[PDB]
Tab-separated table of N, CA and C and ligand atoms in Angstrom:
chain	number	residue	atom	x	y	z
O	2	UNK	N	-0.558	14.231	26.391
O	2	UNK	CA	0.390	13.495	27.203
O	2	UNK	C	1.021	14.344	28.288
O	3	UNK	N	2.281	13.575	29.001
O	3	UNK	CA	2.397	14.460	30.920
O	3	UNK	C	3.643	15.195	30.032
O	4	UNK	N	3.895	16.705	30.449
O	4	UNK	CA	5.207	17.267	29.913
O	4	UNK	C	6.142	16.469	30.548
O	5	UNK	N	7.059	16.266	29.228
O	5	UNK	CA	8.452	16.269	30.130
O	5	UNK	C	9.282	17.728	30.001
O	6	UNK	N	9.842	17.795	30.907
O	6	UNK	CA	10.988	19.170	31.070
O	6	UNK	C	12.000	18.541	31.807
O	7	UNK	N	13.110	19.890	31.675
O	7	UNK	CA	14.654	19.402	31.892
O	7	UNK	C	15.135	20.199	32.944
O	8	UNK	N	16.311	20.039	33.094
O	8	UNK	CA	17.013	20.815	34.033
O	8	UNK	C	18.397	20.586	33.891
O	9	UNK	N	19.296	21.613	33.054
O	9	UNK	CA	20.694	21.405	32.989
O	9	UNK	C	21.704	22.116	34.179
O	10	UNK	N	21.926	20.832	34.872
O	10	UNK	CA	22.782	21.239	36.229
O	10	UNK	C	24.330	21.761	35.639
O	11	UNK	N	24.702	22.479	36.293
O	11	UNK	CA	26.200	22.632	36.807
O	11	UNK	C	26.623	22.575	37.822
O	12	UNK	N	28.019	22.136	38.312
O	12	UNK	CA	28.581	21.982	39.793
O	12	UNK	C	29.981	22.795	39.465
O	13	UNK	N	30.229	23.947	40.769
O	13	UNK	CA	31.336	25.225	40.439
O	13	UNK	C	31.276	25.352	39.072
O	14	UNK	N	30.309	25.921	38.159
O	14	UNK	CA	30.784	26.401	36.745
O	14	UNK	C	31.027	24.954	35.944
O	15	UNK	N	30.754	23.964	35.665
O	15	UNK	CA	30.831	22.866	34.936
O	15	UNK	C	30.018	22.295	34.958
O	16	UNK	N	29.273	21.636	33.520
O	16	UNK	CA	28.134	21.066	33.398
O	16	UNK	C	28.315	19.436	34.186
O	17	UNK	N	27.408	18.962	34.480
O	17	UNK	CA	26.995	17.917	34.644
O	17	UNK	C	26.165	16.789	34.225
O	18	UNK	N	25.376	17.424	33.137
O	18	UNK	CA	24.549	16.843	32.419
O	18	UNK	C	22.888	17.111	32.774
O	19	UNK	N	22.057	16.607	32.139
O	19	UNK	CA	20.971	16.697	32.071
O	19	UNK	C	19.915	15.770	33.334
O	20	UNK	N	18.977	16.392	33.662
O	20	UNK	CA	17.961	15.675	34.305
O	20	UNK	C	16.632	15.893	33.645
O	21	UNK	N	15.869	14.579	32.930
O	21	UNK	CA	14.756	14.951	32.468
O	21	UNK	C	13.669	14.339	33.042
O	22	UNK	N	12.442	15.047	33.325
O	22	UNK	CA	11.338	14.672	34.447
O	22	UNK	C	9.814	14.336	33.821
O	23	UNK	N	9.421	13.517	33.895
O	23	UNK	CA	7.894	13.531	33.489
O	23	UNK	C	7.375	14.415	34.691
O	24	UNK	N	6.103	14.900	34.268
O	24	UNK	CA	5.466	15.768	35.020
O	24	UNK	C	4.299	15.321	35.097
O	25	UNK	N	3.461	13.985	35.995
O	25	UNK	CA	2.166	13.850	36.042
O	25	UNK	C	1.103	14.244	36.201
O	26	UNK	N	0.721	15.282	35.028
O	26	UNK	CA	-0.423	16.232	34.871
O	26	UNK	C	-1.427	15.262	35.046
O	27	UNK	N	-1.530	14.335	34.759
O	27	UNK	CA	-2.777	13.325	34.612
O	27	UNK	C	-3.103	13.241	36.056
O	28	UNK	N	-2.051	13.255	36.850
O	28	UNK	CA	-2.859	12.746	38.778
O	28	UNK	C	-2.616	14.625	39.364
O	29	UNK	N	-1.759	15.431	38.559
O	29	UNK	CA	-1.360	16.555	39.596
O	29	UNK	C	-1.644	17.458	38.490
O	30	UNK	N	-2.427	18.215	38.010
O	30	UNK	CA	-2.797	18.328	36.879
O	30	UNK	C	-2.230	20.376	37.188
O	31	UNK	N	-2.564	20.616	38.386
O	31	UNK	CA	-1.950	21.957	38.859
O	31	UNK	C	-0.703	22.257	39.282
O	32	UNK	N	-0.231	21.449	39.821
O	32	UNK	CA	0.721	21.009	40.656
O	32	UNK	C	2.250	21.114	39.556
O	33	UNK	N	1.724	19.989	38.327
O	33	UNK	CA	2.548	19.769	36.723
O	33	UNK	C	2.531	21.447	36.249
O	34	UNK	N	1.519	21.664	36.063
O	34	UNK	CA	1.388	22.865	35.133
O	34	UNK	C	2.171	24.242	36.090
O	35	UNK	N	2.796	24.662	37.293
O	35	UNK	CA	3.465	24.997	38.128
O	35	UNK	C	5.172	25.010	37.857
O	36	UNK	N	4.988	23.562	38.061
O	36	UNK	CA	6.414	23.340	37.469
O	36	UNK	C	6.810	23.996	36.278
O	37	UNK	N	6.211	23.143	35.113
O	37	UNK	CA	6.185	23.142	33.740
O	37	UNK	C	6.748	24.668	33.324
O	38	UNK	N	5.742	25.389	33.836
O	38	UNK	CA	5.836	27.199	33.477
O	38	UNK	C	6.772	27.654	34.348
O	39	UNK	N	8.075	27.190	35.785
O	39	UNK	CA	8.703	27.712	35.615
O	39	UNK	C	9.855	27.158	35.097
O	40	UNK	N	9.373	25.859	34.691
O	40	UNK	CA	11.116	25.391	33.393
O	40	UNK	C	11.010	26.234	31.993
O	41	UNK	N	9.594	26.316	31.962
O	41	UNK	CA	10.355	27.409	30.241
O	41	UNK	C	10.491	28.817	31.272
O	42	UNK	N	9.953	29.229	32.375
O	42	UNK	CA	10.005	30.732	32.398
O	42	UNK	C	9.235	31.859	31.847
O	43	UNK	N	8.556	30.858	31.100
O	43	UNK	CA	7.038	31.857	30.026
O	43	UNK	C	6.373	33.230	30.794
O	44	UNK	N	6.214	32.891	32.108
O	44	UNK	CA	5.392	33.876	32.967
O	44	UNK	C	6.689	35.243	33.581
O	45	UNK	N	7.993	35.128	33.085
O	45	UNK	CA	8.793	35.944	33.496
O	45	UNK	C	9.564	35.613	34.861
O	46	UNK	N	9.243	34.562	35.247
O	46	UNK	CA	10.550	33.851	36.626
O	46	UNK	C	10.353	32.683	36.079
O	47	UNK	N	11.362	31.488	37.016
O	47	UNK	CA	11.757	30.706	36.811
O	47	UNK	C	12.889	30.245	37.190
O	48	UNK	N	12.881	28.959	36.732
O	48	UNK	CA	13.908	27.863	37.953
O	48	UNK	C	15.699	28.569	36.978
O	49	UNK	N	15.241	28.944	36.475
O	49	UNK	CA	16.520	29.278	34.908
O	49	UNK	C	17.433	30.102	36.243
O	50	UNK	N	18.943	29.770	36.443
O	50	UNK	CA	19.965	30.486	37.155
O	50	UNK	C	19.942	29.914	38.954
O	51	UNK	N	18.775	29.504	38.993
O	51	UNK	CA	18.648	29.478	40.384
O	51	UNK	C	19.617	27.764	40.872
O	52	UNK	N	19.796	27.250	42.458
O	52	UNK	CA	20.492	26.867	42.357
O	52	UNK	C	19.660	25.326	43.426
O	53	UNK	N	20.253	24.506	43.498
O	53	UNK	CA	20.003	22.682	44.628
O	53	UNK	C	20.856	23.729	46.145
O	54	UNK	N	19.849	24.210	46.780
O	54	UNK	CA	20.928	25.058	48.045
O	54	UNK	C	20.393	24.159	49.636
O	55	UNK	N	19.585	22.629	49.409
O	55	UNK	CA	19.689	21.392	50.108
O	55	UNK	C	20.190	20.516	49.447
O	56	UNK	N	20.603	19.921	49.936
O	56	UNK	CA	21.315	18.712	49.747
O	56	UNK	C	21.494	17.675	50.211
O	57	UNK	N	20.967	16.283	50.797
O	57	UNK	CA	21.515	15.789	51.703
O	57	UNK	C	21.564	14.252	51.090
O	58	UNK	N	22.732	13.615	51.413
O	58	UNK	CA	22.916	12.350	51.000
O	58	UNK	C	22.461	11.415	51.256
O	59	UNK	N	21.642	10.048	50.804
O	59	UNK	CA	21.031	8.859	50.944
O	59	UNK	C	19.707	9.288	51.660
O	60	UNK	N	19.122	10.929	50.838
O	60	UNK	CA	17.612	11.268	51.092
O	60	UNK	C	17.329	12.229	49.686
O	61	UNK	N	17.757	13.241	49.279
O	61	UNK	CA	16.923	13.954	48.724
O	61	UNK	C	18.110	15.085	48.514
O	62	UNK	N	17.566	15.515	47.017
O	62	UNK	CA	18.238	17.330	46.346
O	62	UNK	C	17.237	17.959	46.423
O	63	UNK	N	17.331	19.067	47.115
O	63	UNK	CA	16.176	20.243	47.065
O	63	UNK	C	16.684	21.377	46.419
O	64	UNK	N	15.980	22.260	45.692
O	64	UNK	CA	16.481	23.406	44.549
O	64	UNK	C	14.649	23.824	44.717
O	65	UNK	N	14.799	24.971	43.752
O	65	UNK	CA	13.900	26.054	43.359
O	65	UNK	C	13.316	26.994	44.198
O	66	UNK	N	14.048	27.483	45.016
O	66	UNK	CA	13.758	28.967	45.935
O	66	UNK	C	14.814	29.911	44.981
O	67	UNK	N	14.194	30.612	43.501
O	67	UNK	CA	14.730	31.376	43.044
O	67	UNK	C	14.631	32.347	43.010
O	68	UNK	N	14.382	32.800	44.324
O	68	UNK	CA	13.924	34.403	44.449
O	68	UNK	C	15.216	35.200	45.956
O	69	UNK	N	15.411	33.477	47.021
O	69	UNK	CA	16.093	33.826	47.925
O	69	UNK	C	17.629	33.150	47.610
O	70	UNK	N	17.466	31.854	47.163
O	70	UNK	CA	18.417	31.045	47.520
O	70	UNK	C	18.526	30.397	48.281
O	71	UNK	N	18.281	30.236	48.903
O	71	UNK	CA	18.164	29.744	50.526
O	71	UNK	C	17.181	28.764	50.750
O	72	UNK	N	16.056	28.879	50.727
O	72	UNK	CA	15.374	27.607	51.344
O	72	UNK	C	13.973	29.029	52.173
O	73	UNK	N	14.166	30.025	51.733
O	73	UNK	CA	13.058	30.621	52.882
O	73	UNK	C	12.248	31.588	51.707
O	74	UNK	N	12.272	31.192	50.163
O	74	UNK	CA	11.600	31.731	49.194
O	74	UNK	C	11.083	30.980	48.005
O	75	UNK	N	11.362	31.268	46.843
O	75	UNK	CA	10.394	31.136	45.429
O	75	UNK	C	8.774	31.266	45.845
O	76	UNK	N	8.342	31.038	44.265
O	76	UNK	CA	6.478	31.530	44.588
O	76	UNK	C	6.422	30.542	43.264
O	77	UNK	N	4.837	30.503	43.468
O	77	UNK	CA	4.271	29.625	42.140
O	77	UNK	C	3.859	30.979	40.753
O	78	UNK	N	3.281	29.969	40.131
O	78	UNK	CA	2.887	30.983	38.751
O	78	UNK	C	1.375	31.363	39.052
O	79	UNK	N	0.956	31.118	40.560
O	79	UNK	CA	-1.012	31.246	40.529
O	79	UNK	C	-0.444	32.382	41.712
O	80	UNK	N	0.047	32.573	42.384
O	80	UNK	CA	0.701	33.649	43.743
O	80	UNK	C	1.755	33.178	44.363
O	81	UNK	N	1.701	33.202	45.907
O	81	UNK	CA	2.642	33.428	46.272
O	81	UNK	C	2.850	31.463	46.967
O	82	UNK	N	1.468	31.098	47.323
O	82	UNK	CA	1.932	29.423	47.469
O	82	UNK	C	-0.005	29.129	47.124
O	83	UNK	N	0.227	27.581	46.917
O	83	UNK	CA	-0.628	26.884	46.461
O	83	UNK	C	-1.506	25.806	47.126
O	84	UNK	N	-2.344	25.422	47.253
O	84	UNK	CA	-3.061	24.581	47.934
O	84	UNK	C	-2.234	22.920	47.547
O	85	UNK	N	-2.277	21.964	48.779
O	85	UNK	CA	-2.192	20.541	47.865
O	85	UNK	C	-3.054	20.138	47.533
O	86	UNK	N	-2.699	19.682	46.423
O	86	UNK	CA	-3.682	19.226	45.211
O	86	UNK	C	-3.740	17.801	45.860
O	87	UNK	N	-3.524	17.229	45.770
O	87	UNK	CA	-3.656	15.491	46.120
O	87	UNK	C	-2.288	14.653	46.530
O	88	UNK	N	-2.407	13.856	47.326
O	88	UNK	CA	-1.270	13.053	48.122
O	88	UNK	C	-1.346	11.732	47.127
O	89	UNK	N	-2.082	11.539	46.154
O	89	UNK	CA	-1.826	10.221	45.346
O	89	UNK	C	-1.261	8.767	45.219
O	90	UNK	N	0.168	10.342	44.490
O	90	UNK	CA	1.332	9.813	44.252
O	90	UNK	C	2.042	9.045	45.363
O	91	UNK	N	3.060	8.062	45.608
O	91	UNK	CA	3.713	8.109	46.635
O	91	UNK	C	5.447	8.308	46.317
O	92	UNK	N	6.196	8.509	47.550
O	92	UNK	CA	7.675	8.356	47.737
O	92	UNK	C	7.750	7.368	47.431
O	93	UNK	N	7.932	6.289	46.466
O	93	UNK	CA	8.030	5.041	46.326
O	93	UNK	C	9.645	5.171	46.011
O	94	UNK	N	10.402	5.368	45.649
O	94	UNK	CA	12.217	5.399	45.619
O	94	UNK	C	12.521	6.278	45.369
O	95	UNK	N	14.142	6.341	44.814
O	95	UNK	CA	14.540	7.187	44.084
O	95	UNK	C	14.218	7.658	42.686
O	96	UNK	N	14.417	9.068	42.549
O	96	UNK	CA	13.936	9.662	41.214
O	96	UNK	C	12.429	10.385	41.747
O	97	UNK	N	11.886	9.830	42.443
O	97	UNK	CA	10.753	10.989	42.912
O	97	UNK	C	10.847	12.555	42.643
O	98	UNK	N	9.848	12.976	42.362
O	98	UNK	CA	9.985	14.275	42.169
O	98	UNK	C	8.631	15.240	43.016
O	99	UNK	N	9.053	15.452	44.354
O	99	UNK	CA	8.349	15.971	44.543
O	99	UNK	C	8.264	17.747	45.534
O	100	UNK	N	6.729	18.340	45.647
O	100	UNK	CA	7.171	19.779	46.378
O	100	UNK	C	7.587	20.083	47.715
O	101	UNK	N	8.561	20.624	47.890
O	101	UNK	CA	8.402	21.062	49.320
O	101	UNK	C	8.048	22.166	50.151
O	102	UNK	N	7.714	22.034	51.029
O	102	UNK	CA	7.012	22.947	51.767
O	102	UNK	C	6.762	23.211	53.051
O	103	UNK	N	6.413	24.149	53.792
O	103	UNK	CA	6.476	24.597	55.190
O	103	UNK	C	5.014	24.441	56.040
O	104	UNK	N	4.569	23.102	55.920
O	104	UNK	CA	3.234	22.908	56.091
O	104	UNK	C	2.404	22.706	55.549
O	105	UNK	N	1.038	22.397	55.407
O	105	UNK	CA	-0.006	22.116	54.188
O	105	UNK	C	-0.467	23.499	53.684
O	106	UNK	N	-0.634	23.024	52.642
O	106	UNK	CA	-1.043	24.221	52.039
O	106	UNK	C	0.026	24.625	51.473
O	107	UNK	N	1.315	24.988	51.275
O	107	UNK	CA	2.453	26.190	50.964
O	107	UNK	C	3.106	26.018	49.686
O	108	UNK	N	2.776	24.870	49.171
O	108	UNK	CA	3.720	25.021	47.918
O	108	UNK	C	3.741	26.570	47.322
O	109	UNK	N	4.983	26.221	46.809
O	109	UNK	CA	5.650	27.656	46.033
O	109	UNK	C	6.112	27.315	44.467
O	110	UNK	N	7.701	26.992	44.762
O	110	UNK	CA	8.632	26.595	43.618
O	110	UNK	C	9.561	25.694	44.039
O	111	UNK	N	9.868	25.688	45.607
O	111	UNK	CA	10.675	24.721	45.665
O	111	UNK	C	10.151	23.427	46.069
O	112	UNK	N	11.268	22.128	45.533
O	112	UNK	CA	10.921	20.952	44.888
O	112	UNK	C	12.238	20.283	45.170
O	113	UNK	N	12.042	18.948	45.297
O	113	UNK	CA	13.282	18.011	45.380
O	113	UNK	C	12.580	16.762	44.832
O	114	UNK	N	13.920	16.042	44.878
O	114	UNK	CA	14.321	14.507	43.839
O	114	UNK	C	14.855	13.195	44.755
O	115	UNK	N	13.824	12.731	45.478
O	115	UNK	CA	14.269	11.684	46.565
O	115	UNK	C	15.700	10.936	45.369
O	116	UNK	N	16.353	10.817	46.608
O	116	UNK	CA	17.686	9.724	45.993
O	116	UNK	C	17.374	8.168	46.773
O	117	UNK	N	16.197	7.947	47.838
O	117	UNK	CA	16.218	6.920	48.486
O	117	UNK	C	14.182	7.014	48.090
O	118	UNK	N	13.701	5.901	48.845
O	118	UNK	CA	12.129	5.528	49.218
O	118	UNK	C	12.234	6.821	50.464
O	119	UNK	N	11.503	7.337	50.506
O	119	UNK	CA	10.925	8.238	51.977
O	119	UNK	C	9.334	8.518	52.184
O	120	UNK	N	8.984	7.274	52.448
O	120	UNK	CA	7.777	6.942	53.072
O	120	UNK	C	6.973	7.573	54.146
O	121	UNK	N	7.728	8.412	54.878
O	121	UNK	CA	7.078	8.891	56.096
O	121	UNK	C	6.608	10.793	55.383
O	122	UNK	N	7.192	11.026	54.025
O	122	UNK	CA	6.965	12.645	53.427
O	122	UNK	C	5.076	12.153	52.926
O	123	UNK	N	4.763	10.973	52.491
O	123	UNK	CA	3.912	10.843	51.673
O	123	UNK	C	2.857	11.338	53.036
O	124	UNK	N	1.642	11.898	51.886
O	124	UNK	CA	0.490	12.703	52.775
O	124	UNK	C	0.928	13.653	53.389
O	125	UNK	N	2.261	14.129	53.576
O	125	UNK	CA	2.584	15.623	53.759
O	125	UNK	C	3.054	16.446	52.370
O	126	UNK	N	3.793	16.089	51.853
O	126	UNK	CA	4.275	16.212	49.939
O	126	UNK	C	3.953	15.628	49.270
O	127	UNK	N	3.734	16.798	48.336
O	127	UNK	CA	2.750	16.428	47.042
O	127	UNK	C	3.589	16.218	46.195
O	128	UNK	N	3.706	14.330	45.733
O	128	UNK	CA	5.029	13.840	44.944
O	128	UNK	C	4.020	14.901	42.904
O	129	UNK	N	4.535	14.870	42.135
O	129	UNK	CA	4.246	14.853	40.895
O	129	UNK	C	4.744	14.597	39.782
O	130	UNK	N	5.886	14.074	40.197
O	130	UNK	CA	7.028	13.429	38.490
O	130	UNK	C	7.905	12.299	39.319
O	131	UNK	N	8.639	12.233	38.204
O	131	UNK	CA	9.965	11.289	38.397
O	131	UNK	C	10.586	11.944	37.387
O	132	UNK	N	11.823	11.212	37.718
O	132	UNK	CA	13.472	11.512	36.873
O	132	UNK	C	13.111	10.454	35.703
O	133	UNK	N	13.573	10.678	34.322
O	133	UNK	CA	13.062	9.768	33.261
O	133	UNK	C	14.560	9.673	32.548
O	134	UNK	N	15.202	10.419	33.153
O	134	UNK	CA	16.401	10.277	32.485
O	134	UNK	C	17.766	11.299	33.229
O	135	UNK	N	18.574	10.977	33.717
O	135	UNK	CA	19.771	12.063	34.258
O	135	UNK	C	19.831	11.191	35.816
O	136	UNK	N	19.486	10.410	36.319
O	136	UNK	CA	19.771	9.249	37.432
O	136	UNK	C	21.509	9.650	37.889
O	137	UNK	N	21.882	9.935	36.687
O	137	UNK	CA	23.616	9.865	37.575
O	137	UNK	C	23.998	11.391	38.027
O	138	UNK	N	23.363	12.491	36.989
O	138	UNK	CA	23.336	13.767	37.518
O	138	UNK	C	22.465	14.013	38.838
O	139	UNK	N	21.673	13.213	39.306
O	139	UNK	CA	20.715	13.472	40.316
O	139	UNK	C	22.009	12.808	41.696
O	140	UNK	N	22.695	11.986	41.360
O	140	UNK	CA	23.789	11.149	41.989
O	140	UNK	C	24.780	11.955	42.221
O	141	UNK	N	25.804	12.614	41.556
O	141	UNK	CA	26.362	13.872	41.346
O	141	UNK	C	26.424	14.553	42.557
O	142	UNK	N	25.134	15.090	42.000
O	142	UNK	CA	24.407	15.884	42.912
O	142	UNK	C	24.365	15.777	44.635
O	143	UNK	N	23.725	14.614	44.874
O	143	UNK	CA	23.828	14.357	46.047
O	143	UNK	C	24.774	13.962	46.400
O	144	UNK	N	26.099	13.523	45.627
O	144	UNK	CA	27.737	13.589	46.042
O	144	UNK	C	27.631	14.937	46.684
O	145	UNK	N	27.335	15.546	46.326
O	145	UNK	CA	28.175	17.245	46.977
O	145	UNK	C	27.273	17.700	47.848
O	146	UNK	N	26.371	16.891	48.720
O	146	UNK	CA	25.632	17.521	50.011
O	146	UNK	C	26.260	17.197	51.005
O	147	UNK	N	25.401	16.842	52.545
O	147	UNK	CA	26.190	16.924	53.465
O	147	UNK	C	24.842	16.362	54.768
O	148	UNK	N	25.313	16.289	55.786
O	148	UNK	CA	23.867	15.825	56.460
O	148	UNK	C	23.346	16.917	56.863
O	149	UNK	N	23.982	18.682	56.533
O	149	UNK	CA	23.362	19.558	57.305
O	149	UNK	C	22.424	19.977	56.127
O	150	UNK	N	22.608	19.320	54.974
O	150	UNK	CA	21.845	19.863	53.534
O	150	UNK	C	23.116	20.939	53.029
O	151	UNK	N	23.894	21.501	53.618
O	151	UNK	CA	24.697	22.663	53.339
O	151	UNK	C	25.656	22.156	51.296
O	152	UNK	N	25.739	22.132	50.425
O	152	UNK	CA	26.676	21.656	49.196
O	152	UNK	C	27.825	22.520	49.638
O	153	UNK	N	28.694	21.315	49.056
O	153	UNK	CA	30.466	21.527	48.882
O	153	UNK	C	30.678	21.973	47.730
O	154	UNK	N	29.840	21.657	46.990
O	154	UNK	CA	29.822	22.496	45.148
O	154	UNK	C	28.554	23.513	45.174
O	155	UNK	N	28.819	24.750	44.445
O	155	UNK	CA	27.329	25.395	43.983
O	155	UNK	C	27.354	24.570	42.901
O	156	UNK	N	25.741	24.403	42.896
O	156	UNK	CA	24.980	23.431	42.182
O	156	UNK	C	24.206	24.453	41.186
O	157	UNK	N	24.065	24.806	39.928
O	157	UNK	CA	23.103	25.561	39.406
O	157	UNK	C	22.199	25.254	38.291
O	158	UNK	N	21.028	25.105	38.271
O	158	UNK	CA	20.406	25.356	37.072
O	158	UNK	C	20.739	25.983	35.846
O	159	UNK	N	21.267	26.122	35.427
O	159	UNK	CA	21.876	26.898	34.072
O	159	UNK	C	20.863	26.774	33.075
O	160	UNK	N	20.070	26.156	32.730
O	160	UNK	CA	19.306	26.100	32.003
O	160	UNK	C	18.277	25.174	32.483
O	161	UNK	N	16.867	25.742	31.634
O	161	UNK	CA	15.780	24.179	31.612
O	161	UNK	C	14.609	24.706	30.961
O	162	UNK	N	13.959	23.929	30.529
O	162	UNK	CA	12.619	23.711	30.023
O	162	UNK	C	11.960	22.942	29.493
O	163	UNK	N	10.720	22.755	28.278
O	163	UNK	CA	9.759	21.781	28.381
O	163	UNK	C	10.311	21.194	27.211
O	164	UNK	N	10.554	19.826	26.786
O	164	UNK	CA	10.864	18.977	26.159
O	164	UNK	C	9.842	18.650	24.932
O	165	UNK	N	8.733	18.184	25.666
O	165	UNK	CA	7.148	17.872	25.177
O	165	UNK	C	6.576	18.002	26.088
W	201	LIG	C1	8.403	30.762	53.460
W	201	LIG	C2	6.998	30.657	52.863
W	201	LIG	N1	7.078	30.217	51.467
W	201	LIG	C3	8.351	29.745	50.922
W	201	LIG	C4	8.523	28.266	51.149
W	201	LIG	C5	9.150	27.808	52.293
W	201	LIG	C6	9.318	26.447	52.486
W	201	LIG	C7	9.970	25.928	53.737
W	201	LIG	N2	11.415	25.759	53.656
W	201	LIG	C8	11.939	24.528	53.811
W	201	LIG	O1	11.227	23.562	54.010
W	201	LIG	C9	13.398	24.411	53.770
W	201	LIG	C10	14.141	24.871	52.664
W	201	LIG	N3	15.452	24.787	52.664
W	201	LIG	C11	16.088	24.264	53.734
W	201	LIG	N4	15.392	23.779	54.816
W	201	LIG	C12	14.055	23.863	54.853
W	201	LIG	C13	13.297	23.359	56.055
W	201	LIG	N5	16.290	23.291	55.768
W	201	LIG	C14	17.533	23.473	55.294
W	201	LIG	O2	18.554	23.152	55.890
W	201	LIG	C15	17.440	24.077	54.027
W	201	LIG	C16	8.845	25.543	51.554
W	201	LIG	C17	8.224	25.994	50.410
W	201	LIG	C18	8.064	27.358	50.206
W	201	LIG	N6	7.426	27.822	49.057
W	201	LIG	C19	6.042	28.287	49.174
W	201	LIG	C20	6.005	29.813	49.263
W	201	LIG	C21	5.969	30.256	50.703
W	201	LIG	O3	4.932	30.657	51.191
């Protein structure tokens, strides 16, 4: 079956609750297995501490550049970025879970969680999960962005990993 894994947010030092994601290994079968290994962290990095450092309201939370912070790092568990695997999936609403990246070809680690449909990313991002559970932490969340992406709260990963 597709892993699910988690992601326990905090906003300034206070939990927020849980976000839990199917990971559609069945259509993204590289793409899943990427993720997956850095929610437990098995390979020695990982999404564990790192922080949502986009943000923007009535579009999308972006997180997993845990190497810069910023938006201009993380790497995958195969090197440093990854081929797209397949455009499939689509942006069909909120709860999407998909990679982002600086052109074709680049996936790394960082990844966002459409809060709206964004139809015009599909065939450039490679969607591979949804939210299966934590809808109001993903909400939260995009409370504290901004239209420059900049958060009014640090947002952090504090914890995560594979469920099943
Ligand atoms: C740099 C090369 N590189 C890292 C890499 C960079 C981006 C591109 N970055 C963004 O798209 C991004 C991130 N954060 C913010 N913005 C943007 C446009 N705008 C904001 O305001 C905040 C996406 C994936 C990877 N990983 C693959 C590994 C890799 O080769």
């Amino acid at each position: 079956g597709n892993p699910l894994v988690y992601l326990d947010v905090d906003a300034n030092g206070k939990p927020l609750g849980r976000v839990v994601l199917e990971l559609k290994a069945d259509v993204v079968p590289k793409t899943a297995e990427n993720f997956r290994a850095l929610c437990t962290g098995e390979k020695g990095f990982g999404y564990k501490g790192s922080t949502f450092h986009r943000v923007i309201p009535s579009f999308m939370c972006q997180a997993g550049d845990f190497t810069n912070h910023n938006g201009t790092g993380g790497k995958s568990i195969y090197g440093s970025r990854f081929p797209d695997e397949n455009f499939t999936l689509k942006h069909v609403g909120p709860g999407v879970l998909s990679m982002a990246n600086a052109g074709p070809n680049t996936n790394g680690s960082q990844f966002f969680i459409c809060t709206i449909k964004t139809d015009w990313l599909d065939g450039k991002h490679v969607v591979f999960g949804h939210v299966i559970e934590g809808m109001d932490v993903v909400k939260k969340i995009e409370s504290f962005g901004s239209k420059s992406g900049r958060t009014s709260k640090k947002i952090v990963i504090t914890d995560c990993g594979q469920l099943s």
